[PDB]
Amino acid sequence: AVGIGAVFLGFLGAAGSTMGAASMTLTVQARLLLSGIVQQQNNLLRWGIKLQARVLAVERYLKDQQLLGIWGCSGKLICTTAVPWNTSWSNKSYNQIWNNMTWMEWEREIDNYTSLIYTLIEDSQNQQEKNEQE
Amino acid sequence: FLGAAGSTMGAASMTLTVQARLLLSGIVQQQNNLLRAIEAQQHLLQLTVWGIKQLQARVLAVERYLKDQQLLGIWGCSGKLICTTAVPWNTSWSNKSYNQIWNNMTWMEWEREIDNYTSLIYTLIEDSQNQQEKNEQELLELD
Amino acid sequence: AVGIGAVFLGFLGAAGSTMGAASMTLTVQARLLLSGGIKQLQARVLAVERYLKDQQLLGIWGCSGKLICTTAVPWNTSWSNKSYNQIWNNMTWMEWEREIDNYTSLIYTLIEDSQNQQEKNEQELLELD
Amino acid sequence: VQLVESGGGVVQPGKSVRLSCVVSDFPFSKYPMYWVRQAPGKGLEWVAAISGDAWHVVYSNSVQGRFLVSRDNVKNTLYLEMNSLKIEDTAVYRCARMFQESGPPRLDRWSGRNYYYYSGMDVWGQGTTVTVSS
Amino acid sequence: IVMTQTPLSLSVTPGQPASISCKSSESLRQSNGKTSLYWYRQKPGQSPQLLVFEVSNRFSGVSDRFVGSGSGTDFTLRISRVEAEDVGFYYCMQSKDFPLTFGGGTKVD
Amino acid sequence: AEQLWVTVYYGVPVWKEATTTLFCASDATEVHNVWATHACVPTDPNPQEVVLENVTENFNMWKNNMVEQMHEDIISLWDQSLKPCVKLTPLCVTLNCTDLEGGEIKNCSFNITTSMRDKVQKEYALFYKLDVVPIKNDNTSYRLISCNTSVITQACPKVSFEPIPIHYCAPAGFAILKCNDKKFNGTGPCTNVSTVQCTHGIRPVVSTQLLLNGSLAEEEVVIRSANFTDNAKIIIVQLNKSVEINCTRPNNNTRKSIHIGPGRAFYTTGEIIGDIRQAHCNISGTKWNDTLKQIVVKLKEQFGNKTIVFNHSDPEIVMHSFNCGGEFFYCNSTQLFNSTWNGTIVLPCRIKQIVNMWQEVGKAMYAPPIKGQIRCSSNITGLILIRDGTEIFRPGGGDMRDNWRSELYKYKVVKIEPLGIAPTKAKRRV
Amino acid sequence: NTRKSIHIGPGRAFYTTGEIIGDIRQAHCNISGTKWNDTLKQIVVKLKEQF
Amino acid sequence: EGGEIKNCSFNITTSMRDKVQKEYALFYKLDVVPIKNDNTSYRLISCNTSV
Ligand SMILES: *[C@@H]1O[C@H](CO[C@@H]2O[C@@H](C)[C@@H](O)[C@@H](O)[C@@H]2O)[C@@H](O[C@@H]2O[C@H](CO)[C@@H](O[C@@H]3O[C@H](CO[C@H]4O[C@H](CO[C@@H]5O[C@H](CO)[C@@H](O[C@@H]6O[C@H](CO)[C@H](O)[C@H](O)[C@H]6O)[C@H](O)[C@H]5NC(C)=O)[C@@H](O)[C@H](O)[C@@H]4O[C@@H]4O[C@H](CO)[C@@H](O[C@@H]5O[C@H](CO)[C@H](O)[C@H](O)[C@H]5O)[C@H](O)[C@H]4NC(C)=O)[C@@H](O)[C@H](O[C@H]4O[C@H](CO)[C@@H](O)[C@H](O)[C@@H]4O)[C@@H]3O)[C@H](O)[C@H]2NC(C)=O)[C@H](O)[C@H]1NC(C)=O
Ligand SMILES: *[C@@H]1O[C@H](CO[C@@H]2O[C@@H](C)[C@@H](O)[C@@H](O)[C@@H]2O)[C@@H](O[C@@H]2O[C@H](CO)[C@@H](O[C@@H]3O[C@H](CO[C@H]4O[C@H](CO)[C@@H](O)[C@H](O)[C@@H]4O)[C@@H](O)[C@H](O[C@H]4O[C@H](CO)[C@@H](O[C@@H]5O[C@H](CO)[C@@H](O)[C@H](O)[C@H]5NC(C)=O)[C@H](O)[C@@H]4O[C@@H]4O[C@H](CO)[C@@H](O[C@@H]5O[C@H](CO)[C@H](O)[C@H](O)[C@H]5O)[C@H](O)[C@H]4NC(C)=O)[C@@H]3O)[C@H](O)[C@H]2NC(C)=O)[C@H](O)[C@H]1NC(C)=O
Ligand SMILES: *[C@@H]1O[C@H](CO[C@@H]2O[C@@H](C)[C@@H](O)[C@@H](O)[C@@H]2O)[C@@H](O[C@@H]2O[C@H](CO)[C@@H](O[C@@H]3O[C@H](CO[C@H]4O[C@H](CO[C@@H]5O[C@H](CO)[C@@H](O[C@@H]6O[C@H](CO)[C@H](O)[C@H](O)[C@H]6O)[C@H](O)[C@H]5NC(C)=O)[C@@H](O)[C@H](O)[C@@H]4O)[C@@H](O)[C@H](O[C@H]4O[C@H](CO)[C@@H](O)[C@H](O)[C@@H]4O)[C@@H]3O)[C@H](O)[C@H]2NC(C)=O)[C@H](O)[C@H]1NC(C)=O
Ligand SMILES: *[C@@H]1O[C@H](CO)[C@@H](O[C@@H]2O[C@H](CO)[C@@H](O)[C@H](O)[C@H]2NC(C)=O)[C@H](O)[C@H]1NC(C)=O
Ligand SMILES: *[C@@H]1O[C@H](CO)[C@@H](O[C@@H]2O[C@H](CO)[C@@H](O)[C@H](O)[C@H]2NC(C)=O)[C@H](O)[C@H]1NC(C)=O
Ligand SMILES: *[C@@H]1O[C@H](CO)[C@@H](O[C@@H]2O[C@H](CO)[C@@H](O)[C@H](O)[C@H]2NC(C)=O)[C@H](O)[C@H]1NC(C)=O
Ligand SMILES: *[C@@H]1O[C@H](CO)[C@@H](O[C@@H]2O[C@H](CO)[C@@H](O)[C@H](O)[C@H]2NC(C)=O)[C@H](O)[C@H]1NC(C)=O
Ligand SMILES: *[C@@H]1O[C@H](CO)[C@@H](O[C@@H]2O[C@H](CO)[C@@H](O)[C@H](O)[C@H]2NC(C)=O)[C@H](O)[C@H]1NC(C)=O
Ligand SMILES: *[C@@H]1O[C@H](CO[C@@H]2O[C@H](CO)[C@@H](O)[C@H](O)[C@H]2NC(C)=O)[C@@H](O)[C@H](O)[C@H]1NC(C)=O
Ligand SMILES: *[C@@H]1O[C@H](CO[C@@H]2O[C@@H](C)[C@@H](O)[C@@H](O)[C@@H]2O)[C@@H](O)[C@H](O)[C@H]1NC(C)=O
Ligand SMILES: *[C@@H]1O[C@H](CO[C@@H]2O[C@@H](C)[C@@H](O)[C@@H](O)[C@@H]2O)[C@@H](O)[C@H](O)[C@H]1NC(C)=O
Ligand SMILES: *[C@@H]1O[C@H](CO)[C@@H](O)[C@H](O)[C@H]1NC(C)=O
Ligand SMILES: *[C@@H]1O[C@H](CO)[C@@H](O)[C@H](O)[C@H]1NC(C)=O
Ligand SMILES: *[C@@H]1O[C@H](CO)[C@@H](O)[C@H](O)[C@H]1NC(C)=O
Ligand SMILES: *[C@@H]1O[C@H](CO)[C@@H](O)[C@H](O)[C@H]1NC(C)=O
Ligand SMILES: *[C@@H]1O[C@H](CO)[C@@H](O)[C@H](O)[C@H]1NC(C)=O
Ligand SMILES: *[C@@H]1O[C@H](CO)[C@@H](O)[C@H](O)[C@H]1NC(C)=O
Numbered sequence A: 001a002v003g004i005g006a007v008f009l010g011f012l013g014a015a016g017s018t019m020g021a022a023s024m025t026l027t028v029q030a031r032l033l034l035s036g037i038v039q040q041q042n043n044l045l046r047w048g049i050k051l052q053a054r055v056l057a058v059e060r061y062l063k064d065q066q067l068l069g070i071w072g073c074s075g076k077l078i079c080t081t082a083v084p085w086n087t088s089w090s091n092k093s094y095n096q097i098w099n100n101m102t103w104m105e106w107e108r109e110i111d112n113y114t115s116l117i118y119t120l121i122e123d124s125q126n127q128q129e130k131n132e133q134e
Numbered sequence B: 001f002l003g004a005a006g007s008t009m010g011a012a013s014m015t016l017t018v019q020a021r022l023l024l025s026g027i028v029q030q031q032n033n034l035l036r037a038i039e040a041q042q043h044l045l046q047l048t049v050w051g052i053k054q055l056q057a058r059v060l061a062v063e064r065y066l067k068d069q070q071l072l073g074i075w076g077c078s079g080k081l082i083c084t085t086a087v088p089w090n091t092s093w094s095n096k097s098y099n100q101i102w103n104n105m106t107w108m109e110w111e112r113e114i115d116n117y118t119s120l121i122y123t124l125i126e127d128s129q130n131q132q133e134k135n136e137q138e139l140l141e142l143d
Numbered sequence C: 001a002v003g004i005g006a007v008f009l010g011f012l013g014a015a016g017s018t019m020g021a022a023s024m025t026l027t028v029q030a031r032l033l034l035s036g037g038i039k040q041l042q043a044r045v046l047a048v049e050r051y052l053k054d055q056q057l058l059g060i061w062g063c064s065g066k067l068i069c070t071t072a073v074p075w076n077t078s079w080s081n082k083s084y085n086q087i088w089n090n091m092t093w094m095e096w097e098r099e100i101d102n103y104t105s106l107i108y109t110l111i112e113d114s115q116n117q118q119e120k121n122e123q124e125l126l127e128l129d
Numbered sequence D: 001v002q003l004v005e006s007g008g009g010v011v012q013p014g015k016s017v018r019l020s021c022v023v024s025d026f027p028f029s030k031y032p033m034y035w036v037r038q039a040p041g042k043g044l045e046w047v048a049a050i051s052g053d054a055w056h057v058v059y060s061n062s063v064q065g066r067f068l069v070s071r072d073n074v075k076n077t078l079y080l081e082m083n084s085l086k087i088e089d090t091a092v093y094r095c096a097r098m099f100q101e102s103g104p105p106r107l108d109r110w111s112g113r114n115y116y117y118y119s120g121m122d123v124w125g126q127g128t129t130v131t132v133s134s
Numbered sequence E: 001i002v003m004t005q006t007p008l009s010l011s012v013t014p015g016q017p018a019s020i021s022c023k024s025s026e027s028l029r030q031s032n033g034k035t036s037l038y039w040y041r042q043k044p045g046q047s048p049q050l051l052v053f054e055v056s057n058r059f060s061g062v063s064d065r066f067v068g069s070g071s072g073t074d075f076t077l078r079i080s081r082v083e084a085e086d087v088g089f090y091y092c093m094q095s096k097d098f099p100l101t102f103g104g105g106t107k108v109d
Numbered sequence F: 001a002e003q004l005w006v007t008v009y010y011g012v013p014v015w016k017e018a019t020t021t022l023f024c025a026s027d028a029t030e031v032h033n034v035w036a037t038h039a040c041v042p043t044d045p046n047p048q049e050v051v052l053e054n055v056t057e058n059f060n061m062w063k064n065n066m067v068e069q070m071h072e073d074i075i076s077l078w079d080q081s082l083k084p085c086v087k088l089t090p091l092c093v094t095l096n097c098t099d100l101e102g103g104e105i106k107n108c109s110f111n112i113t114t115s116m117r118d119k120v121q122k123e124y125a126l127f128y129k130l131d132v133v134p135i136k137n138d139n140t141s142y143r144l145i146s147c148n149t150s151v152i153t154q155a156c157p158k159v160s161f162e163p164i165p166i167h168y169c170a171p172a173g174f175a176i177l178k179c180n181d182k183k184f185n186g187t188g189p190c191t192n193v194s195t196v197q198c199t200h201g202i203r204p205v206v207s208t209q210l211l212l213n214g215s216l217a218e219e220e221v222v223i224r225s226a227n228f229t230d231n232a233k234i235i236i237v238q239l240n241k242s243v244e245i246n247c248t249r250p251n252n253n254t255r256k257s258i259h260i261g262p263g264r265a266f267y268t269t270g271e272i273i274g275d276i277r278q279a280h281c282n283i284s285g286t287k288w289n290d291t292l293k294q295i296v297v298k299l300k301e302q303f304g305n306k307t308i309v310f311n312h313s314d315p316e317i318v319m320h321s322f323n324c325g326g327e328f329f330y331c332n333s334t335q336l337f338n339s340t341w342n343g344t345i346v347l348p349c350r351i352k353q354i355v356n357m358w359q360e361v362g363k364a365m366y367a368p369p370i371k372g373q374i375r376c377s378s379n380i381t382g383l384i385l386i387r388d389g390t391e392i393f394r395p396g397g398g399d400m401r402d403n404w405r406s407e408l409y410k411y412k413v414v415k416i417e418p419l420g421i422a423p424t425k426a427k428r429r430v
Numbered sequence G: 001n002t003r004k005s006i007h008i009g010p011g012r013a014f015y016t017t018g019e020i021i022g023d024i025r026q027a028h029c030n031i032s033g034t035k036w037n038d039t040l041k042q043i044v045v046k047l048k049e050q051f
Numbered sequence H: 001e002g003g004e005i006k007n008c009s010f011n012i013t014t015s016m017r018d019k020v021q022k023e024y025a026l027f028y029k030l031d032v033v034p035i036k037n038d039n040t041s042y043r044l045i046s047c048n049t050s051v
Helices: A020-031 A051-071 A104-112 A114-127 B009-015 B027-035 B049-074 B097-100 B107-116 B118-130 B134-138 C028-032 C042-060 C085-090 C093-099 C104-116 C118-124 F065-071 F074-080 F285-299 G033-046
Strands: B082-088 C006-010 D009-012 D022-023 D033-038 D045-051 D057-061 D068-074 D079-080 D092-100 D109-114 D121-124 D127-131 E003-006 E018-024 E036-040 E049-052 E066-070 E073-079 E089-094 F004-011 F106-109 F125-127 F131-135 F142-144 F152-154 F174-179 F193-195 F210-212 F237-250 F253-261 F264-271 F280-284 F320-323 F327-330 F344-350 F364-366 F374-385 F392-395 F411-415 F419-424 G006-009 G013-014 H032-034 H041-042
Touching: A020 E049, A020 F004, A051 A114, A051 B027, A051 B049, A051 C042, A051 E003, B009 B097, B049 C028, B049 C042, B049 F004, B049 F074, B049 F419, B082 B118, B097 F419, B107 F419, B118 B134, B118 C006, B118 C028, B118 F004, B134 F125, C042 C104, C093 F285, C104 C118, D009 G033, D033 D121, D045 D068, D092 D127, D121 E049, E018 E036, E018 E089, E049 E066, E073 E089, F065 F074, F065 F411, F152 F374, F193 F253, F210 F320, F237 F285, F253 G006, F280 F285, F285 F344, F374 F419
Parallel strands: D009 D127, F152 F364
Antiparallel strands: B082 F004, C006 D109, D022 D079, D033 D045, D033 D092, D045 D057, D068 D079, D092 D121, E003 E018, E018 E073, E036 E049, E036 E089, E066 E073, F004 F419, F106 F125, F131 F142, F174 F193, F174 F411, F210 F374, F237 F280, F237 F374, F253 F264, F280 F344, F320 F327, F327 F344, F374 F392, G006 G013, H032 H041
C-alpha cells in the first residue's frame, strides 16, 4: 500500500500559517476534537478510570457549543459582531499581525484579557440584541 | 428559573424576556467551575463513593440537556424561545376558551391538563410541518 | 386489554421503501436515536458520543438544525453510474449505502473545505459597503 | 345512577332487534361501556365493549360478526343490535359501566399505534331479556 | 385464558369465618403495577353489585370483614365472621385481556 | 373566530416530583477523613435562594427519598474506609485477665501472635469490661465479645472522625424545594416555598437518644410525628436554645503497638498515667429543667390531659451513645428522665471499643486507643422520645435513620422540565 | 432432608445437610413413557429428509 | 446401592481458634475419596484444586 502527499492540510497542519492563511483549515481542527478517530474496537473482553476521560471530552465540547449559543453563533465557524475593539487589550494594528503572525503568538498577546472579552461579547451582542427583538 | 411559578401564563411571558431568566447561562457558569480540575489535581486520590455519584450526576446533566435541544432542533425552532408553528390547534385537546388559558391559569396545572395529549402533539409538529416543509422547500429550489 | 393498528409510521418502517417514500419519514428515526452492573453506563455514553459526532458534522456543513439541506458541491458522475429516476424511485437506502461506501470520505472533505469553509471567507468580506 | 334498557322481548331465529340502554347523569363520553350475558342457571359471559370515543370495539368470539354496538354521547344512549339469532342466545343482557374512568388513547412513541385501556365493571343495569324460539 | 374457582357450594350459618379462592391459569399482573382481578356478588334475581374492585381495595357500602389477597396465580377472597345475608353467588372476574372471562359463581347458603 | 395555532415556549416554570442521585459539596489538606472526604466539589458562598409567590406543596418527612439515600451511602462511606485495614482474626484466643467501681480495666495476657509460624509471641494487653466475656470451664479467663459474631476489623489509626457539614447539591436541571413555615407539622402543605440549588450544612453526627450539633428550630419548640395515637411512630423533639454539654475522658492513656500483621501494627492501651478516673459528662442543671417544661406545653397540645411523665428506657440499646473525638462514649442518662408535670448535672459514662453497625450484624469495628486527654463540647438540640399509651415517655431505641429525618424535613427533589406548548393565534408563515 | 447446625467461620455459619426423617428413598425422575416412546418416532420423520 | 452410607467426623477450630472439635455431618458419594495407607478414611475430591 502506497500513499501520495496531502492536498487537504491534515490535523494541526496550518499551525505555522498566518492568521489569514490558517483559516482554511478550521474545519479539520473542529471535527477531530471530539473522540478523535474512534479507538476501542469493541474489545470488551476481560475498572472505572478508562470512563472519566471520555465524559470530560464531551464536557469540553458542550462548553463551547453552549458558549457559541450565547454568543449568537451556533453552527457557524466565523461570525461577526457589533463589538468594537478596545486597543488597550493590544493596539497592534491590522497587517502588523494578520499577514505576519501565527495563532500561537496571537494567543500569547490576549491571554491576560481573555475573560474580559467574554463578558463583552455576551452582553453587547446578545443581551443587547435581546432588547431589539420586540 | 421558576420565579413566576405562581404567576399566570398571560403574565409570565412578560418576565420571560430574560433568557428564561438566563436558564442555560446558569449551566455554563456552573460547568466552568464544575470543571475545576481539582479532580485532576488529585485523580480523586482513589475511586470514591462520591465520584461514582458525580459520574452518574454529570451524565444526566448531559442527556437531559440534549433531549431538550434535539426536540427544539427538530421542530424548526432551534435556539429560539418563542416560535410559532403551522399546526392547527384541535379543540378536542382542550375545550377551554382563550382567556382562561392565558389570563386565568397557572403553568403546572396546565401541564396536567394536556399531559395525556402531549405526545400526540409531538408527532403532529414534525410529520405535519418539519418533515413536510423541507420537501416543499426543496421543490422550490428545483426551479 | 388494549390495542389498535398503526397510525403514522413505525421505527425503521421505511427501510424497505424507496427514497421518495422514505424522505417523508425521517423524524421517527430522528427522535428515538438518543432516548431509548456498570455496563448500562458504558452504553449510556457511547449512545451520546455517537450522537454528538453526527450532530457535529451537520454543524460544520452549514446544515445544523435542518433535517435536509442542499449545498453547492457538484455531484460527480464518476461516483454513480445510476440514472436519476432509478435512484429516487427504485433503490432503497440500505442498498444505497453499500454503493457509495467507498466514496464517503471524499464527500465529507469536499463539503467543508470545498464550500462551507469557503462560504465564510467570502461571507465575512461582503462587508465594508 | 339510573341505568336501564329497552327493546327486549322474544323473537324468532334469523331475526334482528336492537336494544337501547340509557344512562342518567355521569359524563357519558368519558367512559367506556360493556355488555354481559348471564344465561339462566349459568354463570356470566362477556359480550362486547366500546371505547369512550366510540372508536374501539371488541366482540366475543362466539357472537363475532353477528351483533352490533354503538354510542351516541350527545343523546347518552347505548345500543346493542343483533343479527342471525340463535336459540342459545336466549339469556339476560345487561348494560354495564366501567368502574374506573378511562383516558384518551395513548400513542406509544416507538410505534405509531394508539392504546385504549379497558378495565372492569361496577354499575350493572337491570337489563332486558331476549328469547329466540318458535 | 382460563380461570375457574372452588368450592361451588358452601351452605353455612352466620358466626364463622371462611374463604373463597379463585384459581388462575394465566398469571395476572398488568404493566400498570396491578393485578386486574375483580370480586363481586349477585343476589338471586338481581343484577350484581361490586364487592371489591381490586384484590386490595374495597368499594363503598362494604363491611370491613371482606379481605382479599393472592399472588399472580393464586387468588383468595376471605370473609371473616360470615354474615347472615351472604346468600347468592360469588363470581371471580378477571380483566387481563379479551375475552375476559369469569368463574362459575360459588353458591353460599 | 381565530383558528388557534400551536406555540412552543422554552423556559416554562414547571416541575414534577422525582428521584435522583446526589453529590457532596464541602466548604473548604491531606484527605484522610471518613465522612468529610475532601475529594469533593467545593461549594459557592453565593446566596442562591429564590423565593416563590403562590405555592401550595405537600411534603413528607418520612416518605422522602432523601433520607433513605444517606443511609445507603453513609454506611458505604464508612465501610470503604474500613476495608483496606488490618483484620483482627488471630486476636480471638484464650485470655487471662486481672485488674489494676472495683476492677474495670483488665490487665489481660494472651500469648500467641503469629508474625511467623514457628515462634508465637506472648503478649501484654489492657482491655475493658464492655469488650470481654467470661468463659465457664476454668478459672478467670476471657475472650473478646464478638468472635463468633462477625469479623472484628481494626480501623486504621491515621484516619479521622470529625463531622464536617455535607451540602447535598442536586445535579443540574434538578432543584430542591424548601419550605419556610415556622409551624410546619412535618407532613402538611406549605405556603412560602423557597427554591435553592444545594442544601444547608448537615453534620454527619452519629449518636443515640439525643442529637448533637443538630440544627435549630426557631422561636419555639417543635414536636413532630405521623401517627400520634399509635405508639409506633416515634416523636422527634427539635429545640431552640442550644443546650451545651461538656464530656471528657479524664485519663492520660498512653498507647503501645503490637506487630501482628507483617507490616500492620496492632494498637492497644500501653499504660494509663495518673489516676483511674471515670469518664463522665456535665450538663447545666438550670437550662435542662427550663427546657423540659417548654416541651410539655407542646405535649399538652397533643396530649392535653393525663400529664406528661418522663421515665428512662442489654448494655447497648438502653444506654445513651455518642462519639467524642474518635472515641465512643456510653453514658447513663437515668437522671434526666425523672420528673413529671402534674447546679451542674453529672452523668456517668462508660467506654466500649468494639462498636457495632447500624444493622449491627456482619461487621464489628474496633477503635484504636488515643493518646492524651479528650475534651469535647457540643450543643444538645435534639431529643428522641417514644410514647407508651397518664402518658409516659421513654427516649427510644436506636434506629439511626431517624437522625436525618430531623434534618431533611424541609427538602424535596423536583425535575425542571422547561419545555412545553400552548395555543395562540399566531401561525408561522411557511 | 432437614436443617442443621455446623460450626461457625468468622461470622460465617456453615451448613451440612441435617438428618433424614428415618427412611431413605432414592431420588428419581419419573417420565410418562408413552409420550416419550411416541416422541422419537416423530423425530425421525424430520430427521430423515436430507438423505 | 452406593450413596449416602457414610456420615463422617473431623476435628476443626475455625473461628474460636483455640481448640479443635469433632463433628457429625451427612455425606453422599461423588465427593469423597478413600485415602491411602489408612483403613476407611475419606477426603474431599476437590481439595487441591482452587477454592
Ligand atoms: C470527478 O472527480 C475527478 C477527481 O476524483 C478523482 O477520482 C476519484 C475516484 C478519486 O480517486 C479522487 O482521489 C480523484 O481526485 C475529477 O477528475 C480529475 O480532473 C483533474 C483536473 O485537474 C485531473 O488532474 C489532472 O491530473 C493529471 C495527472 O497528473 C499526474 O501525472 C502527470 C504526468 O502525466 C503523465 O505523463 C506521462 C508522460 O507523457 C503520460 O504517459 C504517456 O501517456 C500516453 C497516454 O496517456 C501514452 O501512454 C504515452 O505513450 C505515455 O508516454 C501519462 O499518461 C500522464 N498521465 C496522465 C494521467 O495524463 C504529472 O505531471 C502530475 O504531477 C501527476 O503526477 C503524479 O504526481 C504524484 C505526486 O504529485 C506522483 O505520486 C508520487 O509517486 C511516488 C512514487 O512514484 C511516491 O509514491 C510519492 O509519494 C507520490 O506522491 C505520481 O507518481 C505522478 N504520476 C505521474 C503519472 O506523473 C495532470 O497532469 C493534469 O495537469 C494537466 O492538465 C491541467 C489542466 O488544467 C494543466 O493546467 C496542466 O498544465 C497539465 O497539462 C491535471 O492536474 C485528475 O486526474 C482527474 N481525476 C480523475 C480523472 O480521476 C473530475 O473532474 C470530477 N468531475 C467533475 C464533474 O467534477
Ligand atoms: C390522563 O390519563 C389518566 C390515565 O392514564 C394515565 O396516564 C397515561 C399516560 C398512561 O400511562 C396510563 O397508564 C395512566 O394510568 C387519567 O387518570 C384517570 O383519572 C380519573 C379522574 O379523572 C380517575 O378516575 C377516578 O378513579 C376512581 C378510582 O381510581 C382510584 O384508583 C386509581 C388507581 O388505583 C387512582 O389513580 C385514583 O386517583 C383513585 O384513587 C374512581 O372511583 C372515580 O370515579 C368515581 O368518582 C367520580 C367523581 O365523582 C364519579 O363521577 C361522577 O358520577 C356521578 C354518578 O353518575 C355523576 O353524577 C357525576 O357527574 C360524575 N362526575 C363528578 C365529577 O362527580 C364516578 O362515577 C365515581 O363516582 C363513584 O361512583 C360509585 C358508584 O356509583 C359510588 O359508590 C356508591 O356509593 C353510595 C354511597 O356509598 C352507594 O353505596 C352506592 O351503592 C355506591 O355504588 C361512589 O360514591 C362515587 N363517588 C363519587 C365521589 O362520586 C374517578 O373516576 C382514574 O382512576 C385515573 N386513572 C385511569 C387509569 O383512568 C387522567 O384523567 C387523564 N387526564 C385527563 C386530563 O383526562
Ligand atoms: C381533532 O381530534 C378529533 C379526535 O381525535 C381522536 O382522538 C385523539 C386523541 C387521537 O387519537 C386522534 O387520532 C383521534 O382521531 C379528530 O376526529 C377524528 O377525525 C377523523 C377524520 O379524519 C375521524 O375518522 C372518521 O372515522 C369514522 C368512523 O370510523 C370508524 O367506524 C367505521 C364504521 O362506522 C360505524 O358504522 C356503524 C354503522 O352501523 C355505526 O353504528 C351506528 O351508530 C349509530 C350511532 O350510535 C346508531 O347507534 C346505529 O344504531 C349504529 O348502527 C357506528 O357508529 C360507526 N362508527 C362511528 C365511530 O361512528 C369503521 O369502518 C372504521 O374502521 C372506524 O372503526 C369514519 O366513518 C370516517 O370516514 C368517513 O368520513 C370521511 C371524512 O368525513 C369520508 O371521506 C369517508 O368517505 C367516510 O364517509 C372517518 O374515517 C375520527 O373518527 C375522529 N375521531 C373521533 C374520536 O371521532 C379531528 O379530526 C381533529 N380535528 C381536526 C381538525 O383534524
Ligand atoms: C413495500 O413494497 C411494496 C412493493 O413491493 C410497496 O407497495 C407499493 O406502494 C405504492 C404506494 O401506494 C403503490 O403505488 C404501489 O402500487 C405498491 N406496489 C404494488 C406492487 O402494489 C410498499 O409501499 C412497500 N412498503 C412501504 C412501507 O413502502
Ligand atoms: C494467668 O496469669 C496468672 C498470673 O501470673 C497465672 O497464675 C500464676 O501461676 C503460677 C504458676 O503456678 C504461679 O506461680 C503464680 O503464683 C500464679 N499467679 C496468680 C496471680 O495466680 C495463671 O497461670 C495464668 N493462666 C491462667 C490460665 O489463669
Ligand atoms: C426559645 O425558647 C425560649 C425558652 O422557652 C422561649 O422563651 C420563652 O418562651 C415562652 C413561650 O413563648 C414564654 O412564655 C417565656 O416568657 C419566654 N421566656 C422565658 C425567659 O422563659 C423563646 O420564646 C424561644 N424563642 C426565641 C427566639 O428565643
Ligand atoms: C393512628 O394510630 C391509631 C392506632 O393507635 C389509629 O387508630 C386505629 O387504627 C386501627 C388500625 O386499622 C383502626 O382499625 C381503628 O379503627 C383506629 N381507631 C380509631 C379510633 O380511629 C389511627 O387510625 C391512626 N391515625 C392515622 C392518621 O394513622
Ligand atoms: C463546659 O466547658 C466550657 C469550656 O469550653 C465552659 O465554658 C466556659 O464557661 C465559663 C463560665 O463558667 C466562662 O467564663 C468561659 O468563658 C467559658 N469558656 C469557654 C471556652 O466556653 C462551660 O461553662 C462548661 N460548662 C457548661 C455547663 O457548659
Ligand atoms: C416565608 O419566609 C420568608 C423568609 O424571609 C427570611 O426570614 C428570615 C427570618 O430570620 C430572615 O432572616 C431573612 O432575612 C428573610 N429573607 C430572606 C431573603 O431570606 C419570609 O420573608 C416570609 O414572610 C415567609 N412567609 C410567611 C407567610 O411567613
Ligand atoms: C381563575 O380565576 C377565577 C376567579 O374569577 C373567575 O373567573 C371566571 C373565569 C369565572 O369562572 C368567574 O366565576 C370568576 O369571575 C377562579 O375562580 C378560578 O379558580 C381561576 N382558575 C381557572 C378558571 O382555571
Ligand atoms: C490432588 O492430589 C491427588 C493425590 O492424592 C492422593 O492420591 C489419590 C489416589 C487418593 O488416594 C488421595 O486420597 C491421596 O491423598 C491427585 O490424585 C489429584 O490429581 C490431585 N488433584 C489436583 C492436582 O487437582
Ligand atoms: C477600554 O476602553 C475604555 C474607554 O472606552 C477605557 O476606559 C478602558 O480602560 C479600556 N479597558 C481596559 C481594560 O483598559
Ligand atoms: C478459680 O479462680 C477463681 C478466681 O479467684 C476462684 O473464684 C475459683 O475458686 C478458682 N477455682 C478453684 C477450684 O479454686
Ligand atoms: C399538619 O396540618 C395539616 C393541615 O394543615 C394536617 O392535615 C396534618 O394532619 C397535620 N399533621 C399531623 C401530623 O397531624
Ligand atoms: C382536659 O380535658 C378537658 C375537657 O375538654 C379540657 O377542658 C381541658 O382543657 C383539658 N386539660 C388540658 C390541660 O388541656
Ligand atoms: C407429573 O405429575 C402430574 C401431577 O399429577 C401429572 O399430571 C403428570 O401426568 C405427571 N407426569 C408423569 C408421571 O410423567
Ligand atoms: C480394616 O479394619 C477391618 C476391621 O476393623 C479389618 O478386618 C481390616 O483388616 C482392616 N484393614 C487394614 C488394617 O488394612
